[PDB]
């Protein structure tokens, strides 16, 4: 049995710089390594195998070395088409993939643009009630959102959902749901979600009153 | 030319049998081993072993020992693995992938199939319920609607069938009480709505639910 273990879980790059990942396998591999791409809804890309060698066709800015029981990836002059998840693997014996390394582009930082939804008279009339919260067009991922009922924080009872990065301006979307019962969602009138981010020293505050 | 052609996603109950299949194209068959993969949700890739189709010699991770079998069918260029005795632990993405040519024991693959999405889940086939975001009370007003409480993935949302398009966003659906839930928006200028009709166009197709949703001021 051989052990890889692949660093970085994930990295910012900037257009035009410098990745590297490295791997480190538990006994000598004799640079029996190789390295694949993977991106949402496709099949992996074999990039590189025997620690260095480029399949014909690979770009020329990925490149690899190593030798005994450690190994590194790079990509140089990054471009956009290269944002992707990457994976060593070990064939000297068995076969045993690193844990994978996700690469995101750094960008221009943004402020999310937040809107807050009450629940809709349809869903009222099932007994549940959901409070929704977008925040559009920002960087870093890295946000803190916070839901404020009457006042006072609420932690439970919301779910997150992140888009992928996007491919036109690099910069991220989210969604922040506060589910509840309907006759909870009634004791209270004051429903706010703010977000604390890199862009903005106070928060960003989105609010609603129930009877207005 | 090379080609591995898999089936789309299936749907199983615990305790269920799955019988995978790859179907190679573009090069000779014997003279490439096959390997199969095994990716979970949001995790890294798994190896779980490989075949000689000219004489079904196998080796194998040890983890997948009396749960994978892998085999071949030489006359149709066919490659199988069938996993056993199947648990939610199971429910993953399955790749077949072509091994560079080589004689040895152990080597790297080269081309990889799209992959076999398997669930293994007792949940049924269960209907959104689909309700319009509107806003309280600004040039640019995001709108959205919230696609609660279906089974099993995937659903799509367009919006005026299709002819607003720019500013759509669509988010992943995430599990709450063991259905799925998405939202998606748009952002539209405060000139267009409420001035004229948005309607949310939400498909389901593994229920037939089709609903098409104006979005109008809240009562």
């Known amino acids: 049995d051989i052990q890889m273990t692949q660093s970085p879980s994930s990295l910012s790059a900037s257009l035009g710089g410098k990745v590297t990942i490295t791997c480190k396998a538990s006994?000598?591999?004799?640079?029996?390594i190789a390295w694949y791409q993977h991106k949402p809804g496709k099949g992996p890309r074999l990039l590189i195998h025997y620690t260095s060698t480029l399949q014909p066709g690979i770009p020329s800015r990925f490149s690899g070395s190593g030798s005994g029981r450690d190994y590194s990836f790079s990509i140089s002059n990054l471009e956009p088409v290269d944002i992707a998840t990457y994976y060593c693997l070990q064939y000297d014996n068995l076969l045993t993939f690193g844990a994978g390394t996700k690469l995101e582009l750094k960008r221009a930082d943004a402020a999310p643009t937040v809107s807050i939804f009450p629940p809709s008279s349809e869903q009222l009339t099932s007994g549940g009630a959901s409070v929704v919260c977008f925040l559009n067009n920002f960087y870093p991922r890295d946000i803190n959102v916070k839901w404020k009922i009457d006042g006072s924080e609420r932690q439970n009872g919301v779910l997150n959902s992140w888009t992928d990065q996007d491919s036109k301006d690099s910069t991220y979307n989210m969604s922040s749901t506060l589910t509840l019962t309907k006759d909870e969602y009634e004791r209270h009138n004051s429903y706010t979600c703010e977000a604390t981010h890199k862009t903005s020293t106070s928060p960003i505050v989105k609010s609603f009153n129930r009877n207005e | 030319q090379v080609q591995l052609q898999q089936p789309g996603a299936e749907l199983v109950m615990p305790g269920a049998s799955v019988k995978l299949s790859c179907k190679a194209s573009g090069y000779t068959f014997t003279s490439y081993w096959m390997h199969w993969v095994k990716q979970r949700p949001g995790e890294g890739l798994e190896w779980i072993g490989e075949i000689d189709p000219s004489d079904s010699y196998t080796n194998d991770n040890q983890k997948f020992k009396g749960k994978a079998t892998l085999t071949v069918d030489k006359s149709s260029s066919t490659a199988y693995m069938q996993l056993s005795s199947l648990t939610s632990e199971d429910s993953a993405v399955y790749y077949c992938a072509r091994r560079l040519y080589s004689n040895s024991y152990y080597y790297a693959m080269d081309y990889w199939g799209q992959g076999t999405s398997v669930t293994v889940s007792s949940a049924k086939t269960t209907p959104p319920s689909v309700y319009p975001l509107a806003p309280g009370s600004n040039s640019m007003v995001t709108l959205g609607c919230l696609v609660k409480g279906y089974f099993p993935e995937p659903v799509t949302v367009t919006w005026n069938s299709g002819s607003l398009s720019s500013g759509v966003h669509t988010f992943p659906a995430v599990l709450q009480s063991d259905l799925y839930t998405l939202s998606s928006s748009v952002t539209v200028p405060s000139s267009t709505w409420p001035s004229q009709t948005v309607t949310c166009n939400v498909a389901h197709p593994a229920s037939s639910t089709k609903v098409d949703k104006k979005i109008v001021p809240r009562d």
């Open positions: 006994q000598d591999i004799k640079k029996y």
